[PDB]
Design a binder for this molecule. Structure first.
Ligand SMILES: Nc1ncnc2c1ncn2[C@@H]1O[C@H](COP(=O)(O)OP(=O)(O)OP(=O)(O)OP(=O)(O)OC[C@H]2O[C@@H](n3ccc(=O)[nH]c3=O)[C@H](O)[C@@H]2O)[C@@H](O)[C@H]1O
Ligand SMILES: [Mg+2]
Ligand SMILES: [Mg+2]
Ligand SMILES: [Mg+2]
Ligand SMILES: [Zn+2]
Lengths: 221, 15, 1113, 263, 83, 94, 104
DNA sequence: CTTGACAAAAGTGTTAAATTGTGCTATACTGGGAGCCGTCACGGATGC
DNA sequence: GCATCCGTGAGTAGAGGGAAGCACAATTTAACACTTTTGTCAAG
């Protein structure tokens, strides 16, 4: 079983677990030799360990069996057709319930990740990780745009009334980060939900008129 | 000597 | 324009095919066209007969024959579809049951073998590649002295690489001889006992040399049985392993006597027989037959060692750097070596598959799994050091790449561990390896070139031709010989004077074992064919090479590879004579197969009616992009109805002019300083070069994009990109691709693509922003392909590949891929690099208008101004002589051919200048003009410098200056003459691949690394510049503390500092104070992973937190 | 363990080394609970010790652990921190920086000692944050965000942007660097002059200190940002202020080549 | 006692500067057992931590210099003294 | 060379002290919008623009020219740091 | 408040456990179909932190108002995602193992 | 400012379908395979 | 002395490169039917 993802010592240790199991279940009344019955358990333990520990991204045993069958089928077709088979040819030979779409999806699943320390070029100074940018942390340009938008938005809110500004800042979630519905806003201010609906819309329409006359908030969209 | 863990294990089980 | 030829040496043979090192070796390995019953035991045929038959030890698998099929796709299709040009391989096998005696035969499919093109290159995954030959130590038996102790020698037996271990025979200080295998030392007497040797046999053969035999006469091991000695030997070789005979005989036999594990090779066996004077039946150290081991080479090796120590005249040490002890492994041998490795793995799978599962019902097809064989072959052609991306900047570039010899690679030397001995020029390189062509730097002396006349023999040894001399007369018989055979003769020089075929000089310069001697004509046995056989092809293209220093000649030959094809390229005024053959052997141009008449001429095709009546149509390659980005095109050179003979030129290839190699332009040059614009190798050019489209080249760039399947949805190539105006979408067609013929600039869109944005929580601010404007968001974003900064041109081609197309093998999840080709015409500008064939190089620093350039008295301005300060220190006088011959040919309207070391001399050049003066000055007299007033003033100073003879007429003195290559030159700015005569002439200058437009780069902010959070590197990645350790030392020495802290934190990896710095500048403020860099935080965490506690403290030793409480529980 | 522009994943070698240690540690727990013989237990304990060694320092003892399907050793924690490619010499004593560029150099004979020639296209990117503020101050752009969108497309750049770029660099200096930097004179400060073209213009008198000629050499450009950084460069690092050799005291900027020949 | 340059640089007090030179494993092992503290005296250690180096404009001899015009000085001096 | 560089180096005991004085003074000018300058109206540095001749925006250039006049006082332990900024703000609102 | 010195010393087993936010019990990295981190693995969000700022692994909290809060269903703390560069875990060995630095 | 009174959206509960995890198979079978020298040359520290 | 072991060897750039199947039990996921929310159109 060597050369399938586990080292030789790892294979031996996993096989030893199967040998222990066979001792408990062995029955000597049948007059069969021990090696006849213990071979089944030793092979099973090694096979299950490979399907569980040989991949960085673990795949369920049922899908691992499907992948092995898919590769074995493709090899037989290749030596008969004299060329690499297509997805349609593999799917037809695979059996009922298989189409070319399922063949391609299975092959995508069976792809292993590549190392970040893989050397590129003959000189040993360049690696794969030297060409992968980071897309998670915001860039300095993106961070500065957010600050400019916030300071201009709060400047426009000052044109509204004191009560009108607070309604918009709560109904949109500019405090604590959470949007607040007409109920919790009403609970905080002691008013109904139909009243807040009108004043929230009323403050929105006054902002639209101001923006059209200056064009100070359009470039941010 | 003892640089091969596989050789070390084989000697032990041979006793 | 007539061509005048110089020279006296008459060459008896022409140059051999220049690519036969690649083409011939691969033909021998494949043996595709020879009938199977007549195939020799070489190449892959020998590999089949070595692994087969496969025996279970009763099932036997036997090999009968093989065949190769037609390639599935043509070469042009493979390049477009990223395929490999290869042919299928089938093997005819039979299975024999030893018990029953039943035989079944069937043909099994083994895989594909890459095919070599007609020019000698491969197409791997759609890309052109070249396999570079390897040089290494030849196998055999060698004898070297012991450096530690004088008077002692060591005998070594070297097999083929990865085909057995080395064996060392050494005499120990105690007198007992030792044999060392696999870093283990043991007495040779023990091994000799296994080989069935008695003391009487040993004493008879090796007892007549001295006291050495006394150490080979032990008696404790002697009386022991050879089988008992065999089990004792196995204990020493394999400590700890249980001592079983089946485990012991299977180890000794497989060490020195197994043809499947030990291979001396054809070269090694031949060398051993020649040195030891014996006849080897096989290629193994010993042969195992009749249950006993038989000696083959150990006794003759030990006999030579004992005799050498005694001091017999017939024994000598071996030089390991001697070219008779070094051989070449060609592409055919390198591929076969990997073929045998893959075949060995196939046999292992067959053996284990025939001992389990359906034993009675077995077929050869079921037993054979060809996947290990295909994997090993594809690895050699893709991920090997000797398999290199093809260099095709110009036709000469690809010719040189195929003739290079490398000492690196698997089984070779290492760039860092190579000493001075291997990098030096040996005396045996004469006529076999070029002494000047090599890369300066860490690869000097490790990568070389084959000589022009040299050729590799069947055993891998380089040979050079010589002319037989008998009785003092030179004959026309030519003999090719190796370095070891060459040492036995006295070989004269090719420049020896001859009266017909008889040597005329009484004193002859010759070589004896590499040393120069003076001998009489009666002592001469061989003669050199030509001076050209000493150098390579690139070096043979440099005229007046004998006047150039070797260091500068290295640059001249290397830089010819980097010349770019030009739209108006022309052949040099002064040539050496190899220009025609280089174009012919590169297969870049088109020639007539036989006599006929041209029927149809077009920019795309040529049709010729041959005499026998068949019609042949030749498609021409137009505007094709090479690996380097240069444009390769073929221009027809015939008309309809023109009669052509066999071999006549039909169409010129890249960098060729009427069948002559054309790597540059011929320009008028003045050698003089000019206002500091010639400072330190800088070059001044005229604007008139740009007006006539001189030094103009065409380049093509390729862009690619893909549409994939995603969990969120499929990417679509479309014209409907959100939030884009009509101006940006003007040049795209309905399918979202840019139309052919449109001009594109940086920031323009080449192909439009949309992606599904995915799920996310719009910031609260953007929530209000979108509510005010009443704009519902879309589910897709812009992911289109745009022109990178500093690029652009004209769209000339678009390629679209879709899933399910015939021959298109896309990766899983990929729907389609689009490729766009953009072409630009590049004119000469400031910063471009120019060079000539003598090693003079520089960049253009100034472009002047025509009225500013110095001009001749007739009004003709010069084109290029060169600084004379670059000549004296470099000692390359060939450019000066080329300029002098160029001036004479400018007025006479003729070109010249001067072979290296035998060509034009100063007396011949000065007589041509005399005729050129009669048309340069005689024309003026007829028109009615005398001598200029300004010319009189310059002549007055000329005699004060001793340049002209006083008392002569002004015309006679002007002729004296002309014979020295100097003319009176006027200043275009003032109209006054230069105070001294200036050397003016015609020179050949090339434009190099390195251009400023491909190297300028800048960045303010951009992508950052994943772990270190530092800016990436490289122009293609829009990266930043590296501020290394030595740069930090410079700022420290200046005392610029705040400047250094900015680069360490604010501009590299202080995330909070770099965000705040950007926002401060755009608001008109000053940058804030820096903070702790992110790289130091990574170092602390990595040290904690090693169970080390690293803590930052304060003035009072209290811990200070540098993680802002984000990691404190 | 990150996804890339395509669909495939990339991960570091440390994840494999951690997986081996966990797999062997968990197997020893199960073996102990089953009352396995001492021979089996002793093999597992020896394998656990070797797994810890590979994670900390791979290859120090025994054969190095390699990934299946290849002969390349896995990078351990010790390999990350040590060597020329380690954390210290590659990321702590030296870094890649922003506001930097590179181009081919040519000779400028008309420049003063304290001047250099900077291409306009390079200067636009090098001083981009300063230029966006300047365009906003004038009527070129309404805001910084709209100003940045204009510079994205080459055909969208008006002629008034180049006038604003002149005002931005007024009085500022940049740093020029040529590798290898043998001494501190390999970095000097110059007052840039905007030129048409793509190559940097270098004063003839500073070539000897840089050991630079004009047969293909390139150079790097850096921009000091703050007032402190500008003051240090203009006072301590200006080319016109460093005329004598720090090693011997003899002049280092002096006539040479054609200048000596003419005089 | 007399030492070479390599041995003298490896015996310095600061473990941060010694570890970045060479023999990093040996340096770190000895420093960890002894519990060494680095006082950040030289130039290399301040570069690693991104701090201002104690030389040039970063030296304590000139770092704390103040600049003020006479108009501000006269107002500052008088206001505090007369009060 | 910077104008008056020889005279500036002769005003300080250490050449790095001159850089500190210039850099700190330049920050003061930028903070108060050049309203705290000690230069006369005819002594202000100017730059040539297409529209006309305007004030020099480079604060380091202003600081070097102010030091040559001799109206600036520099040294260590001159005034308390807090007292300096608060007094400057009251005299030069910005 | 300013760093003035750096100390290096040995770490006890008790100190190593005080650094860790949890024990890694499985070698699994991420799920093969969802591509999400697996529980008790080398990338678990309950140990090292959330993938994105202020969002648990069960889609119940998505706001900054719950600063320093731990979800009662998934156990992921509602905080910044940058903590995944600083938070460490630990593995409890069945038998002690020596440090190779102090041996070789 | 509020009540009413829908209408779509968000929330909840149940459940079948899909996916994932775990145990077992009785002729007899009982110590690995791969590698192969221009083995890099030179100080420095340590063990004996 | 002399044998054994161990760490060290200039910088920047580019440019290619990149081998079983089955049954059965738990467990998770997706579809779908009510049901409380919560924004809204219209008065007053
Ligand atoms: N303006 C002046 N410029 C120069 N010297 C002037 C001047 N004025 C007065 N002097 C005086 O003259 C003496 C020199 O006189 P000289 O005749 O010997 O000079 P030269 O003509 O040979 O020019 P040079 O550039 O040295 O040639 P090179 O070796 O090919 O340069 C290749 C360069 O590439 C670099 N490189 C290469 C490969 C590699 O792996 N790593 C690597 O870093 C490396 O930087 C190398 O240097 C001077 O000391 C001075 O006192
Ligand atoms: Mg090179
Ligand atoms: Mg030079
Ligand atoms: Mg140069
Ligand atoms: Zn949750």
């Amino acid at each position: 079983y060597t050369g399938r993802g586990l080292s030789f010592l790892d294979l031996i240790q996993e096989g030893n677990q199967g040998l222990i199991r066979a001792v408990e279940k062995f029955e000597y009344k049948r007059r069969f030799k021990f090696s006849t019955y213990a071979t089944w358990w030793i092979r099973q333990a090694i096979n299950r360990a490979i399907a569980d520990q040989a991949r960085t991204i673990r795949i369920p045993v049922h899908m691992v069996e499907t992948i092995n069958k898919l590769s074995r089928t493709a090899r037989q077709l290749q030596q008969e057709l004299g060329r690499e088979p297509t997805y349609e040819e593999i799917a037809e030979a695979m059996g009922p319930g298989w189409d070319a779409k399922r063949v391609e999806e299975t092959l995508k699943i069976a792809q292993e990740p590549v190392s970040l320390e893989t050397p590129i070029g003959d000189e040993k100074d360049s690696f794969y990780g030297d060409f992968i940018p980071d897309e998670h942390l915001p860039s300095p340009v993106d961070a500065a745009t957010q600050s400019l938008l916030s300071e201009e938005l709060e400047k426009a809110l000052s044109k509204l009334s004191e009560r009108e500004a607070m309604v918009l800042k709560l109904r949109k979630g500019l405090i604590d980060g959470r949007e607040h519905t007409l109920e919790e806003v009403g609970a905080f201010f002691g008013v109904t939900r139909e009243r807040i609906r009108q004043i929230e819309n009323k403050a929105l329409r006054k902002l639209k008129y101001h923006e059209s006359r200056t064009r100070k908030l359009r470039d941010f969209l | 000597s003892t640089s091969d863990p596989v050789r070390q294990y084989l000697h032990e089980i041979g006793q | 324009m007539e061509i005048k030829r110089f020279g006296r040496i008459r060459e008896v043979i022409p140059l051999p095919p220049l690519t036969e090192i690649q083409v011939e070796s691969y033909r021998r390995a494949l043996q595709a066209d020879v009938p199977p019953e007549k195939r020799e035991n070489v190449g892959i045929q020998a590999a089949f007969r070595e692994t087969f038959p496969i025996e279970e030890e009763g099932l036997v698998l036997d090999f009968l024959e093989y065949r190769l099929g037609e390639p599935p796709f043509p070469q042009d299709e493979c390049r477009e579809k990223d395929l490999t040009y290869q042919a299928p391989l089938y093997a005819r096998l039979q299975l024999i049951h030893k018990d029953t005696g039943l035989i079944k035969e069937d043909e099994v499919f083994l895989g594909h073998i890459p095919l070599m093109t007609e020019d000698g290159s491969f197409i791997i995954n759609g890309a052109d590649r070249v396999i570079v030959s390897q040089i290494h130590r030849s196998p055999g038996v060698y004898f070297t002295p012991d450096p530690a102790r004088p008077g002692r020698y060591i005998a070594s037996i070297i097999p083929l690489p990865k085909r057995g271990p080395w064996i060392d025979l050494e005499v120990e200080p105690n007198g007992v001889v030792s044999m060392k295998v696999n870093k283990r030392k043991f007495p040779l007497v023990l091994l000799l006992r296994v080989l069935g040797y008695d003391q009487e046999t040993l004493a008879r053969e090796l007892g007549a040399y001295g006291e050495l035999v006394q150490g080979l006469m032990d008696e404790s091991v002697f009386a022991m049985r050879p089988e008992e000695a065999l089990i004792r030997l196995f204990t020493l070789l394999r400590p700890g392993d249980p001592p079983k005979r089946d485990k012991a005989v299977a180890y000794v036999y497989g060490l020195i006597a197994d043809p499947r594990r030990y291979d001396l090779g054809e070269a090694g066996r031949y060398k051993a027989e020649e040195k030891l004077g014996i006849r080897l039946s096989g290629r193994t150290l010993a042969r195992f037959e009749d249950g006993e081991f038989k000696d083959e080479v150990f006794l003759p090796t030990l006999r030579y060692l004992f005799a050498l120590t005694a001091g017999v005249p017939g024994h000598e040490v071996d030089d390991i750097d001697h070219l008779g002890n070094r051989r070449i492994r060609t592409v055919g041998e390198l591929m076969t070596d990997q073929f045998r490795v893959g075949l060995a793995r196939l046999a292992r799978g067959v053996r284990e598959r025939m001992l389990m599962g359906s034993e009675d019902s077995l077929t050869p097809a079921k037993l054979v799994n060809s996947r290990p064989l295909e994997a090993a072959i594809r690895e050699f052609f893709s991920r090997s050091q000797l398999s290199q991306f093809k260099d095709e900047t110009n036709p000469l570039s690809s010719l040189r790449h195929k003739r290079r010899i490398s000492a690196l690679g698997p089984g070779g030397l290492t760039r860092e561990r190579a000493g001075f001995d291997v990098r030096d020029v040996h005396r045996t390189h004469y006529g076999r390896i070029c002494p000047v062509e090599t890369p300066e730097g860490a690869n000097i002396g490790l990568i070389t070139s084959l000589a022009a006349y040299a050729r590799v023999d069947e055993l891998g040894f380089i040979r050079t031709p010589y002319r037989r001399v008998v009785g003092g007369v030179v004959t026309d018989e030519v003999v090719y010989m190796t370095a070891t055979e060459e040492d036995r003769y006295t070989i004269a020089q090719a420049n020896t004077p001859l009266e017909g075929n008889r040597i005329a000089a009484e004193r002859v310069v010759a070589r004896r074992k590499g040393e120069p001697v003076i001998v009489s004509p009666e002592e001469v046995e061989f003669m050199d064919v030509s001076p050209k056989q000493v150098f390579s092809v690139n070096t043979n293209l440099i005229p007046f090479l004998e006047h150039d220093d070797a260091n500068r000649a290295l640059m001249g030959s290397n830089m010819q590879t980097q010349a770019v094809p030009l739209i108006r390229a022309q052949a040099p005024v002064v040539m050496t004579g190899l220009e025609e053959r280089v174009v012919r052997d590169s297969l870049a141009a088109l020639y007539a197969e036989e006599d006929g008449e041209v029927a149809k001429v077009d920019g795309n095709r040529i049709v010729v009616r041959y005499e026998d009546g068949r019609l042949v149509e030749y498609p021409l390659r137009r505007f094709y992009r090479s690996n380097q980005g240069t444009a390769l095109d073929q221009r027809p050179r015939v008309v309809v109805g023109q009669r052509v003979r066999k071999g006549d030129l039909l169409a010129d290839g890249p960098a060729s002019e009427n069948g002559f190699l054309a790597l540059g332009q011929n320009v008028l040059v003045a050698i003089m300083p000019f206002d500091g614009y010639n400072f330190e190798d800088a070059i001044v050019i005229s604007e008139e070069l740009l007006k006539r489209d001189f030094y103009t080249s065409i380049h093509i760039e390729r862009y690619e994009i893909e549409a994939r399947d995603t969990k969120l949805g499929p990417e679509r190539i479309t014209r409907d990109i959100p939030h884009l105006s009509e101006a940006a979408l003007r040049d795209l067609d309905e399918e979202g691709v840019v139309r052919i013929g449109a001009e594109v600039k940086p920031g323009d869109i080449l192909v439009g693509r949309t992606s599904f944005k995915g799920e996310s929580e719009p910031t609260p601010e953007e929530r209000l922003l979108r509510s005010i404007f009443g704009e519902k968001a879309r589910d897709v974003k812009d992911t289109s392909l745009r022109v990178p900064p500093g690029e652009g041109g004209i769209v000339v081609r678009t390629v679209r590949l879709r899933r399910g197309d015939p021959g298109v093998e896309l990766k899983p999840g990929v729907r389609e891929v689009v490729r766009v080709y953009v072409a630009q015409k590049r004119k000469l500008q400031v910063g471009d690099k120019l060079a000539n064939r003598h090693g003079n190089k520089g960049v253009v620093a100034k472009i002047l208008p025509v009225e500013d350039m110095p001009h001749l008295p007739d009004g003709t301005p010069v084109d290029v101004i060169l600084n004379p300060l670059g000549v004296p220190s470099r000692m390359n006088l060939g450019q000066i002589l080329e300029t002098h011959l160029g001036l004479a040919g400018y007025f006479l309207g003729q070109r010249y051919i001067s072979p290296i070391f035998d060509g034009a001399k100063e007396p011949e050049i000065k007589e041509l200048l005399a005729q050129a003066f009669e048309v340069y000055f005689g024309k003026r007299k007829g028109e009615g003009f005398g001598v200029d007033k300004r010319e009189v003033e310059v002549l007055r100073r000329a005699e004060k410098l001793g340049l002209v003879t006083p008392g002569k007429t002004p015309e006679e003195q002007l002729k004296e200056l002309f014979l020295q290559g100097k003319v009176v030159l006027y200043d275009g700015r003032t109209g006054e003459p230069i105070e001294g005569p200036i050397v003016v002439g015609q020179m050949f200058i090339m434009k190099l691949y390195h251009m400023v437009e491909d190297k300028m780069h800048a960045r303010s902010t951009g992508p950052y690394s994943l772990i270190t959070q530092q800016p990436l590197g490289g122009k293609a990645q829009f990266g930043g510049q590296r501020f290394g350790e030595m740069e930090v030392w410079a700022l420290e020495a200046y005392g610029a503390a705040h400047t250094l802290q900015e680069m360490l934190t604010l501009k590299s990896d202080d995330i909070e500092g770099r965000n705040a710095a950007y926002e401060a500048i755009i608001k008109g403020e000053d940058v804030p104070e820096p903070s702790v860099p992110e790289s130091f935080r990574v170092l602390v965490k990595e040290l904690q992973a090693l169970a080390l506690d690293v803590q930052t403290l304060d003035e009072k030793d209290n811990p200070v937190d540098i993680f802002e409480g984000l990691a404190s529980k | 363990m990150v996804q890339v522009d395509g669909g495939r994943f990339a991960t570091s070698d440390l994840n494999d080394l951690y997986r081996r240690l966990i797999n062997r540690n968990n197997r020893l727990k199960k073996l102990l609970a089953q009352g396995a013989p001492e021979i089996i237990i002793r093999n597992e304990k020896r394998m656990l010790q070797e797994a810890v060694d590979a994670l900390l320092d791979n290859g120090r003892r025994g054969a190095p652990v390699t990934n299946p399907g290849s002969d390349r050793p896995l990078r351990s924690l010790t390999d990350i921190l040590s060597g020329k490619q380690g954390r210290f010499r590659q990321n702590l004593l030296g870094k890649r920086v922003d506001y930097s560029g590179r181009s081919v150099i040519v000779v400028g004979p008309q420049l003063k000692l304290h001047q250099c020639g900077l291409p306009k296209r390079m200067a636009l990117e090098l001083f981009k944050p300063f230029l966006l503020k300047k365009m906003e101050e004038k009527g070129i752009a309404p805001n910084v965000k709209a100003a940045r969108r204009m510079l994205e497309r080459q055909r969208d750049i008006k002629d008034e942007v180049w006038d604003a770029l002149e005002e931005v660099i007024h009085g500022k200096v940049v740093l020029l660097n040529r590798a290898p930097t043998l001494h501190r004179l390999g970095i000097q400060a110059f007052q840039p002059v905007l030129v048409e073209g793509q190559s940097i213009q270098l004063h003839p008198l500073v070539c000897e200190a840089f050991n630079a000629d004009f047969d293909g050499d390139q150079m790097a450009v850096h921009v000091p940002l703050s007032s402190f950084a500008q003051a240090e460069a203009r006072i301590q690092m200006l080319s016109a202020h460093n005329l004598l050799s720090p090693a011997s005291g003899e002049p280092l900027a002096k006539p040479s080549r054609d200048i000596i020949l003419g005089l | 006692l007399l030492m070479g340059v390599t041995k003298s640089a490896l015996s310095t007090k600061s473990w941060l500067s010694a570890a970045s030179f060479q023999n990093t494993t040996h340096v770190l092992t000895e420093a960890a057992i002894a519990g060494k503290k680095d006082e950040l005296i030289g130039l290399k250690e301040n570069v690693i931590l991104g701090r201002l180096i104690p030389a040039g404009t970063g030296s304590d001899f000139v770092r704390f210099t103040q600049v003020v015009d006479q108009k501000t000085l006269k107002a500052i001096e008088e206001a505090r003294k007369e009060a | 060379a910077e104008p008056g560089i020889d005279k500036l180096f002769g005003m300080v005991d250490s050449k790095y002290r001159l850089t500190v004085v210039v850099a700190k003074r330049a920050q003061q000018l930028l903070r108060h919008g050049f309203k705290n300058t000690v230069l006369e109206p005819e002594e202000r540095p100017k730059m040539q623009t297409l529209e006309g001749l305007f004030d020099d925006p480079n604060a380091v250039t202003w600081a070097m020219k102010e030091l040559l006049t001799g109206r600036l006082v520099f040294g260590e332990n001159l005034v308390p740091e807090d007292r300096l900024q608060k007094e400057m703000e009251r005299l030069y609102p910005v | 408040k300013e760093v003035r010195k750096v100390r290096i010393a040995l770490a006890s087993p008790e100190k190593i456990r005080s650094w860790s936010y949890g024990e890694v019990e499985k070698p699994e990295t991420i799920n093969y179909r969802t591509l999400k981190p697996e529980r008790d693995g080398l990338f678990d969000e309950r140990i090292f932190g959330p993938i994105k700022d202020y969002e648990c692994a069960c889609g119940k909290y998505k706001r900054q108002r719950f600063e320093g809060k731990v979800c009662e269903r998934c156990g992921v703390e509602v905080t910044k995602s940058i903590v995944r560069r600083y938070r460490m875990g630990h593995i409890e060995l069945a038998t002690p193992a020596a440090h190779i630095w102090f041996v070789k």
